[PDB]
Design a protein around this ligand. Sequence first.
Ligand SMILES: [Cl-]
Ligand SMILES: [Cl-]
Ligand SMILES: [Cl-]
Ligand SMILES: [Cl-]
Ligand SMILES: [Cl-]
Ligand SMILES: [Cl-]
Ligand SMILES: [Cl-]
Ligand SMILES: [Cl-]
Ligand SMILES: [Cl-]
Ligand SMILES: [Cl-]
Ligand SMILES: [Cl-]
Ligand SMILES: [Cl-]
Ligand SMILES: [Cl-]
Ligand SMILES: [Cl-]
Ligand SMILES: [Cl-]
Ligand SMILES: [Cl-]
Ligand SMILES: [Cl-]
Ligand SMILES: [Cl-]
Ligand SMILES: [Cl-]
Ligand SMILES: [Cl-]
Ligand SMILES: [Cl-]
Ligand SMILES: [Cl-]
Ligand SMILES: [Cl-]
Ligand SMILES: [Cl-]
Ligand SMILES: [Cl-]
Ligand SMILES: [Cl-]
Ligand SMILES: [Cl-]
Ligand SMILES: [Cl-]
Ligand SMILES: [Cl-]
Ligand SMILES: [Cl-]
Ligand SMILES: [Cl-]
Ligand SMILES: [Cl-]
Ligand SMILES: [Cl-]
Ligand SMILES: [Cl-]
Ligand SMILES: [Cl-]
Ligand SMILES: [Cl-]
Ligand SMILES: [Cl-]
Ligand SMILES: [Cl-]
Ligand SMILES: [Cl-]
Ligand SMILES: [Cl-]
Ligand SMILES: [Cl-]
Ligand SMILES: [Cl-]
Ligand SMILES: [Cl-]
Ligand SMILES: [Cl-]
Ligand SMILES: [Mg+2]
Ligand SMILES: [Mg+2]
Ligand SMILES: [Mg+2]
Ligand SMILES: [Mg+2]
Ligand SMILES: [Mg+2]
Ligand SMILES: [Mg+2]
Ligand SMILES: [Mg+2]
Ligand SMILES: [Mg+2]
Ligand SMILES: [Mg+2]
Ligand SMILES: [Mg+2]
Ligand SMILES: [Mg+2]
Ligand SMILES: [Mg+2]
Ligand SMILES: [Mg+2]
Ligand SMILES: [Mg+2]
Ligand SMILES: [Mg+2]
Ligand SMILES: [Mg+2]
Ligand SMILES: [Mg+2]
Ligand SMILES: [Mg+2]
Ligand SMILES: [Mg+2]
Ligand SMILES: [Mg+2]
Ligand SMILES: [Mg+2]
Ligand SMILES: [Mg+2]
Ligand SMILES: [Mg+2]
Ligand SMILES: [Mg+2]
Ligand SMILES: [Mg+2]
Ligand SMILES: [Mg+2]
Ligand SMILES: [Mg+2]
Ligand SMILES: [Mg+2]
Ligand SMILES: [Mg+2]
Ligand SMILES: [Mg+2]
Ligand SMILES: [Mg+2]
Ligand SMILES: [Mg+2]
Ligand SMILES: [Mg+2]
Ligand SMILES: [Mg+2]
Ligand SMILES: [Mg+2]
Ligand SMILES: [Mg+2]
Lengths: 174, 174, 174, 174
Amino acid sequence: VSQVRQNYHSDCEAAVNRMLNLELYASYTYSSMYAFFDRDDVALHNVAEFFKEHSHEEREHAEKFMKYQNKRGGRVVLQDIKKPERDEWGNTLEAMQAALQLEETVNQALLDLHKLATDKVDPHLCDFLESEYLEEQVKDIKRIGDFITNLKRLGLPENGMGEYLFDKHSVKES
Amino acid sequence: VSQVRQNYHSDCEAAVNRMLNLELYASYTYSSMYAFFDRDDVALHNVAEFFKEHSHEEREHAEKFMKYQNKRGGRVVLQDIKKPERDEWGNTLEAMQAALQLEETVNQALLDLHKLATDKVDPHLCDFLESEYLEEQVKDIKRIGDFITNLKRLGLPENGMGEYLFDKHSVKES
Amino acid sequence: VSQVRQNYHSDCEAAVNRMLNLELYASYTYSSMYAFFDRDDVALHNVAEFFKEHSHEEREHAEKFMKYQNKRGGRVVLQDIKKPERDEWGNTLEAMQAALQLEETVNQALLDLHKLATDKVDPHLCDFLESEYLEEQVKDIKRIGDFITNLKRLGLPENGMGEYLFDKHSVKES
Amino acid sequence: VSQVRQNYHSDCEAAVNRMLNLELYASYTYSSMYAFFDRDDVALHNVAEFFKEHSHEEREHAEKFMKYQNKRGGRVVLQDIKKPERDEWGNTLEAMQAALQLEETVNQALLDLHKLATDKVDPHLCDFLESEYLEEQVKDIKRIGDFITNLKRLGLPENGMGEYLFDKHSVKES
Ligand SMILES: [Cl-]
Ligand SMILES: [Cl-]
Ligand SMILES: [Cl-]
Ligand SMILES: [Cl-]
Ligand SMILES: [Cl-]
Ligand SMILES: [Cl-]
Ligand SMILES: [Cl-]
Ligand SMILES: [Cl-]
Ligand SMILES: [Cl-]
Ligand SMILES: [Cl-]
Ligand SMILES: [Cl-]
Ligand SMILES: [Cl-]
Ligand SMILES: [Cl-]
Ligand SMILES: [Cl-]
Ligand SMILES: [Cl-]
Ligand SMILES: [Cl-]
Ligand SMILES: [Cl-]
Ligand SMILES: [Cl-]
Ligand SMILES: [Cl-]
Ligand SMILES: [Cl-]
Ligand SMILES: [Cl-]
Ligand SMILES: [Cl-]
Ligand SMILES: [Cl-]
Ligand SMILES: [Cl-]
Ligand SMILES: [Cl-]
Ligand SMILES: [Cl-]
Ligand SMILES: [Cl-]
Ligand SMILES: [Cl-]
Ligand SMILES: [Cl-]
Ligand SMILES: [Cl-]
Ligand SMILES: [Cl-]
Ligand SMILES: [Cl-]
Ligand SMILES: [Cl-]
Ligand SMILES: [Cl-]
Ligand SMILES: [Cl-]
Ligand SMILES: [Cl-]
Ligand SMILES: [Cl-]
Ligand SMILES: [Cl-]
Ligand SMILES: [Cl-]
Ligand SMILES: [Cl-]
Ligand SMILES: [Cl-]
Ligand SMILES: [Cl-]
Ligand SMILES: [Cl-]
Ligand SMILES: [Cl-]
Ligand SMILES: [Mg+2]
Ligand SMILES: [Mg+2]
Ligand SMILES: [Mg+2]
Ligand SMILES: [Mg+2]
Ligand SMILES: [Mg+2]
Ligand SMILES: [Mg+2]
Ligand SMILES: [Mg+2]
Ligand SMILES: [Mg+2]
Ligand SMILES: [Mg+2]
Ligand SMILES: [Mg+2]
Ligand SMILES: [Mg+2]
Ligand SMILES: [Mg+2]
Ligand SMILES: [Mg+2]
Ligand SMILES: [Mg+2]
Ligand SMILES: [Mg+2]
Ligand SMILES: [Mg+2]
Ligand SMILES: [Mg+2]
Ligand SMILES: [Mg+2]
Ligand SMILES: [Mg+2]
Ligand SMILES: [Mg+2]
Ligand SMILES: [Mg+2]
Ligand SMILES: [Mg+2]
Ligand SMILES: [Mg+2]
Ligand SMILES: [Mg+2]
Ligand SMILES: [Mg+2]
Ligand SMILES: [Mg+2]
Ligand SMILES: [Mg+2]
Ligand SMILES: [Mg+2]
Ligand SMILES: [Mg+2]
Ligand SMILES: [Mg+2]
Ligand SMILES: [Mg+2]
Ligand SMILES: [Mg+2]
Ligand SMILES: [Mg+2]
Ligand SMILES: [Mg+2]
Ligand SMILES: [Mg+2]
Ligand SMILES: [Mg+2]
């Protein structure tokens, strides 16, 4: 047993490792989206850079779980990072719809971990999730939902001019 | 009778309280518009912020009537602030049309108060309305009429791309 | 159902709308206090400005609930904003006593919402209340209790010189 | 007839000369108050300086009527400036009560001149009064009423400590 370990349940330790893996998985999916939108036959570079930044964010969130695990005296255990579900992402609407689902999946895992931390009476883990994850998750989901509404408004998937304009005006110029 | 009161008719005092209530009512309607355009299924954030700023303006104009009332030795009497007529506002065109009607209503109440102040030979109240309200009212009505013309030009309500572009180009970026 | 909605109970959504209304109600009561202390026959302008600032704070806290509601995919539903319980507020002691009761009422509604969020296993709503409301509420209650103790010390309600001095020294010069 | 004169009734010209005299009269009364509060056996120097500043303000307002008269092609006609009604002013309360009455008298003369300008269809004279006089008059009356309320609160005329404190805290330090 680690000399620092206190009030840290084995189940929470294991769930933190799973959460670490899921954040790496999410980062990898966003990287795939980046590379798709960077293609010469897709060529929406502001959308591409949005996904690249989100890939970096998810990787940072993985690293935070690693640091957390060690702070509590748990032990980081890594597994394979599964490739993304798709090799190509259709268009900006399809990608953002997939991003929404991914954020919802990550959010459910965070909420499930909070339930487990609550069940095991671990307020430090509860605080960690609430302070570092749950609100930024809600913000990201809201942003992507807002995007989807605008892409539909712009006539995606059929309206290429709409898709062009989204890339110029809804995501930051890169 | 207040020690400061001079040339201030009871009818004007009461009409100032009604005007205070109407400005609060107007502020509340603009707040509702703000919240509508902030929805994830509406998501026109520059339009939303336009209405939020107008809500704050109308609240400031209410406060100015309160300060006025006391300066003249009248007594502020508050009533309920009625909820807005609608819970949802359709789209940017419908909202701006409602905003135009609201500004016209507020303008008519201001013009009616000026008539009353004139009838009661109250030049200080006349000056107040002319200097602090009537011209800014005309400017706001003109701005919103200009907006409506452009929203029609852009093909509202059917043309979502038009609605998107209005939000990017006609209202200030927030 | 909103595309962003996750782990958000209908009961919580409705309680958030009620909380929004209560903050608007509170703002309106403080506005009334402002106008009372601004009267020529009351004329305690630092006290007046204290209440004006608190009215603006409560309105900002209402706006935060609106933004919250939309972030979670709930729907803002507005009701009338009831006028304050009194048209005149006696003196600084009576007003501060009413302010204390109002803050206690708002605090109880916040604590009740936290209980509901807890019952519905909504940690994001719990965090929101804890991070944005509950501590600032405790601070405001403490400040007003401290004020009441000093107003009693100063001999309110009978001691006008005491009331004058409170306005010069206990609330910020405006 | 002056080469510049247009739409300027003889009655208005004469009333402007009377108004000029009244402003000089008012200035002189405030000067008397200044000298009273400067006495070694009165010695309220912030109150004294308040009245001195008001004497200078009223003299500037006289000068503005002179300039007005010439701008319209009327002719400045001066009369004696009557000494103030009192040689000594009692205490701060009595003085402020007299100041209130004086401001009310000046305000009534301004309102009477506005009525005359209205009757003679002189919008330039109306504008002049509204823009340069009527609102600053209302502000001064409000300020002095507020002062009187506070002097009563402080226990004037009997409470010397109250009178001392007013001089330190309600009027600007000179
Ligand atoms: Cl342990
Ligand atoms: Cl423990
Ligand atoms: Cl364990
Ligand atoms: Cl895993
Ligand atoms: Cl596998
Ligand atoms: Cl694929
Ligand atoms: Cl495409
Ligand atoms: Cl967070
Ligand atoms: Cl958006
Ligand atoms: Cl289309
Ligand atoms: Cl957008
Ligand atoms: Cl009157
Ligand atoms: Cl009159
Ligand atoms: Cl009347
Ligand atoms: Cl009303
Ligand atoms: Cl009703
Ligand atoms: Cl509706
Ligand atoms: Cl729309
Ligand atoms: Cl104006
Ligand atoms: Cl325009
Ligand atoms: Cl069209
Ligand atoms: Cl435009
Ligand atoms: Cl839900
Ligand atoms: Cl859940
Ligand atoms: Cl539900
Ligand atoms: Cl309600
Ligand atoms: Cl009711
Ligand atoms: Cl009452
Ligand atoms: Cl009082
Ligand atoms: Cl807080
Ligand atoms: Cl204190
Ligand atoms: Cl006492
Ligand atoms: Cl204090
Ligand atoms: Cl003429
Ligand atoms: Cl003419
Ligand atoms: Cl003539
Ligand atoms: Cl004369
Ligand atoms: Cl004589
Ligand atoms: Cl005398
Ligand atoms: Cl004295
Ligand atoms: Cl003025
Ligand atoms: Cl004062
Ligand atoms: Cl006393
Ligand atoms: Cl004062
Ligand atoms: Mg060891
Ligand atoms: Mg284990
Ligand atoms: Mg595989
Ligand atoms: Mg618990
Ligand atoms: Mg936080
Ligand atoms: Mg984020
Ligand atoms: Mg996120
Ligand atoms: Mg996240
Ligand atoms: Mg463009
Ligand atoms: Mg552009
Ligand atoms: Mg009285
Ligand atoms: Mg009345
Ligand atoms: Mg109703
Ligand atoms: Mg007229
Ligand atoms: Mg103007
Ligand atoms: Mg305006
Ligand atoms: Mg307006
Ligand atoms: Mg207006
Ligand atoms: Mg939907
Ligand atoms: Mg419901
Ligand atoms: Mg009622
Ligand atoms: Mg917390
Ligand atoms: Mg905190
Ligand atoms: Mg606070
Ligand atoms: Mg509070
Ligand atoms: Mg609070
Ligand atoms: Mg002191
Ligand atoms: Mg001091
Ligand atoms: Mg000549
Ligand atoms: Mg003549
Ligand atoms: Mg004589
Ligand atoms: Mg006029
Ligand atoms: Mg003016
Ligand atoms: Mg003045
Ligand atoms: Mg004046
Ligand atoms: Mg004046």
